[PDB]
Design a protein around this ligand. Structure first.
Ligand SMILES: OC[C@H]1O[C@H](O[C@@H]2[C@H](O)[C@@H](O)[C@H](O[C@H]3[C@H](O)[C@@H](O)[C@H](O)O[C@@H]3CO)O[C@@H]2CO)[C@H](O)[C@@H](O)[C@H]1O
Ligand SMILES: OC[C@H]1O[C@H](O[C@@H]2[C@H](O)[C@@H](O)[C@H](O[C@H]3[C@H](O)[C@@H](O)[C@H](O)O[C@@H]3CO)O[C@@H]2CO)[C@H](O)[C@@H](O)[C@H]1O
Ligand SMILES: OC[C@H]1O[C@H](O[C@@H]2[C@H](O)[C@@H](O)[C@H](O[C@H]3[C@H](O)[C@@H](O)[C@H](O)O[C@@H]3CO)O[C@@H]2CO)[C@H](O)[C@@H](O)[C@H]1O
Ligand SMILES: OC[C@H]1O[C@H](O[C@@H]2[C@H](O)[C@@H](O)[C@H](O[C@H]3[C@H](O)[C@@H](O)[C@H](O)O[C@@H]3CO)O[C@@H]2CO)[C@H](O)[C@@H](O)[C@H]1O
Ligand SMILES: OC[C@H]1O[C@H](O[C@@H]2[C@H](O)[C@@H](O)[C@H](O[C@H]3[C@H](O)[C@@H](O)[C@H](O)O[C@@H]3CO)O[C@@H]2CO)[C@H](O)[C@@H](O)[C@H]1O
Ligand SMILES: OC[C@H]1O[C@H](O[C@@H]2[C@H](O)[C@@H](O)[C@H](O[C@H]3[C@H](O)[C@@H](O)[C@H](O)O[C@@H]3CO)O[C@@H]2CO)[C@H](O)[C@@H](O)[C@H]1O
Ligand SMILES: OC[C@H]1O[C@H](O[C@@H]2[C@H](O)[C@@H](O)[C@H](O[C@H]3[C@H](O)[C@@H](O)[C@H](O)O[C@@H]3CO)O[C@@H]2CO)[C@H](O)[C@@H](O)[C@H]1O
Ligand SMILES: OC[C@H]1O[C@H](O[C@@H]2[C@H](O)[C@@H](O)[C@H](O[C@H]3[C@H](O)[C@@H](O)[C@H](O)O[C@@H]3CO)O[C@@H]2CO)[C@H](O)[C@@H](O)[C@H]1O
Ligand SMILES: OC[C@H]1O[C@H](O[C@@H]2[C@H](O)[C@@H](O)[C@H](O)O[C@@H]2CO)[C@H](O)[C@@H](O)[C@H]1O
Ligand SMILES: OC[C@H]1O[C@H](O[C@@H]2[C@H](O)[C@@H](O)[C@H](O)O[C@@H]2CO)[C@H](O)[C@@H](O)[C@H]1O
Ligand SMILES: OC[C@H]1O[C@H](O[C@@H]2[C@H](O)[C@@H](O)[C@H](O)O[C@@H]2CO)[C@H](O)[C@@H](O)[C@H]1O
Ligand SMILES: OC[C@H]1O[C@H](O[C@@H]2[C@H](O)[C@@H](O)[C@H](O)O[C@@H]2CO)[C@H](O)[C@@H](O)[C@H]1O
Ligand SMILES: OC[C@H]1O[C@H](O[C@@H]2[C@H](O)[C@@H](O)[C@H](O)O[C@@H]2CO)[C@H](O)[C@@H](O)[C@H]1O
Ligand SMILES: OC[C@H]1O[C@@H](O)[C@H](O)[C@@H](O)[C@H]1O
Ligand SMILES: OC[C@H]1O[C@@H](O)[C@H](O)[C@@H](O)[C@H]1O
Lengths: 69, 69, 69, 69, 69
């Protein structure tokens, strides 16, 4: 799956339908995998750099693949 | 959904029916989403600023949307 | 529900029937809510002050309401 | 249930059947309770002192009761 | 099961089928056990040394046994 954005997590958002939104770089993306919610908030809190891989690389796009550096 | 309060978490409370109460700004609100309980206690412990979005913006109102900054 | 003890968590214990015991102040109390186990060990590790509310305010009493400050 | 060992966690191990092994003091013991896995890794990472209570107090013995000081 | 790599976690990756990849030493390996995902990210964030035991000791190989010191 192609890389889409790499950067620190600027903010995260819990959504009304239990999906989770993340802003990394200049894109706002969401995931429906509940396992990723605490992993991404820990990355945010400790300042890790994440790379999100997705074909829907646009605002509002979904993802499931994340690399944590 | 409109913004209702933005601030640091002042305290959290675990309720008898397994919902979770939070006091942010001047409002005391609750959520029934179990996934938000450890995310909001981590935001409290590390001093993050949260924005709660809800139409029930009054004491005792419920919410499910939270932004973590 | 009335306040029973306020203080820092002295120790926590995992019990043979999957309940969790906590010692706050001068009372040792237990809860059967599994969601409270990691929230109380985080409060212990980061030194938060907790208030437990319960009518069974005696050693061995149960509880479910906790305020985290 | 009698005390068996008290000390800091030397290492933890994830086992092929999803049980979890811990070495505290001079004993290596395991638990089948999935709730204890992140509680024991947090105790190892932050250097807490744990007391394990079990009648199978020998290498390879199982336990479920742990006190976190 | 034989030791395969020992080292600090260099990166972790959440995969599209909910498995989790880890790079330790010179090998990139994956596990399908959901319980290991937050244990390995905590090991990565706090700089623990992990030993992965597996017979598939090659890039792309799977594992389930991890020692955390
Ligand atoms: O978290 C939501 C969602 O994330 C991942 O899917 C993403 C989009 O939501 C999904 O619509 C998109 O599907 C593409 C296929 O990748 C592509 O092969 C096909 O040609 O078109 C469809 C529709 O546009 O894929 C992205 C991820 O690349 C995740 O895969 C999905 O299971 C779900 O978790
Ligand atoms: O906001 C603080 C408040 O949160 C919790 O109460 C929630 C609502 O605020 C409250 O309106 C709601 O009341 C329920 C009662 O639980 C129920 O017994 C009764 O029959 O119906 C009313 C609504 O008409 O309760 C929710 C919780 O689900 C929290 O319980 C409360 O102590 C306080 O912290
Ligand atoms: O955790 C409780 C609850 O949070 C969210 O709902 C909030 C209030 O609890 C709910 O009463 C309120 O309902 C609104 C409708 O959204 C609005 O369309 C209608 O016009 O008025 C009612 C009453 O004010 O909505 C807020 C959130 O905006 C969450 O949606 C819900 O599932 C539940 O988790
Ligand atoms: O803290 C949330 C929750 O804690 C207690 O429930 C625990 C689990 O959260 C709950 O899913 C679990 O349910 C069991 C059934 O009791 C059992 O009959 C069935 O076979 O399996 C499910 C899943 O393992 O029960 C434990 C407590 O034993 C608490 O009871 C519950 O009300 C709520 O507070
Ligand atoms: O975690 C165990 C238990 O904690 C909470 O209940 C507590 C005691 O376990 C329970 O026996 C006690 O019951 C009270 C009633 O609240 C009171 O109205 C009646 O007059 O007397 C009995 C005995 O004193 O209540 C406390 C909490 O106040 C929790 O409510 C329960 O679900 C369970 O989790
Ligand atoms: O996590 C594994 C296991 O831990 C707890 O049980 C322990 C041993 O696994 C179990 O064999 C041992 O059984 C004892 C009885 O306690 C004792 O009453 C009887 O006389 O002898 C047997 C054999 O030694 O008990 C220990 C804990 O004392 C836990 O109870 C069990 O559910 C399971 O989690
Ligand atoms: O020294 C702790 C030990 O924990 C793990 O092994 C546990 C017991 O110590 C071990 O005796 C037990 O072995 C069982 C198998 O579970 C069972 O499937 C097989 O048929 O019989 C043997 C002997 O009764 O397994 C438990 C774990 O469930 C761990 O495997 C070991 O490396 C070591 O850490
Ligand atoms: O998470 C993936 C997987 O990890 C563990 O299995 C590993 C490989 O996935 C599996 O192919 C490999 O199988 C070995 C046999 O154990 C061995 O007896 C035989 O000689 O060779 C095959 C192929 O190399 O085993 C490794 C771990 O050693 C885990 O056991 C499995 O349940 C699953 O979690
Ligand atoms: O990330 C793990 C799973 O997350 C989502 O499922 C959640 C929850 O984990 C599951 O128990 C429940 O049945 O559905 C939830 C979403 O409605 C994904 O939808 C799953 O496919 C898993 O990836
Ligand atoms: O821009 C990111 C948004 O993510 C969530 O919405 C997505 C998606 O954008 C939307 O079209 C879809 O219907 O629902 C998804 C969530 O389930 C949030 O709900 C939005 O607030 C944005 O953060
Ligand atoms: O956040 C997870 C879900 O919370 C609420 O459900 C919880 C719990 O997760 C569920 O497994 C249980 O059966 O009921 C609980 C509520 O009584 C919400 O109802 C869900 O929408 C999820 O958000
Ligand atoms: O600690 C939680 C429970 O652990 C064991 O069960 C786990 C898991 O929690 C359960 O949902 C799954 O179906 O089986 C697992 C392996 O047995 C214990 O058997 C339970 O008593 C709980 O302690
Ligand atoms: O974490 C141990 C187990 O992980 C995998 O199962 C997960 C999850 O734990 C389970 O609750 C869910 O129903 O299915 C998931 C797999 O898609 C393993 O497959 C299990 O065998 C356990 O090892
Ligand atoms: O006060 C709560 C008590 O709960 C019991 O189940 C346990 O055996 C005691 O050791 C104590 O923890
Ligand atoms: O080399 C291990 C590989 O494991 C696969 O399951 C995963 O999809 C790949 O991205 C890679 O991590």
């Amino acid at each position: 799956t192609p890389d889409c954005v790499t950067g620190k997590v600027e903010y995260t958002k819990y959504n009304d339908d239990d999906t989770f939104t993340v802003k990394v770089g200049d894109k706002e993306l969401f995931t429906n995998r509940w396992n990723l919610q605490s992993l991404l908030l820990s990355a945010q809190i400790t300042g890790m750099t994440v790379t999100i891989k997705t074909n829907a690389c646009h605002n509002g796009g979904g993802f499931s693949e994340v690399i944590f550096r």
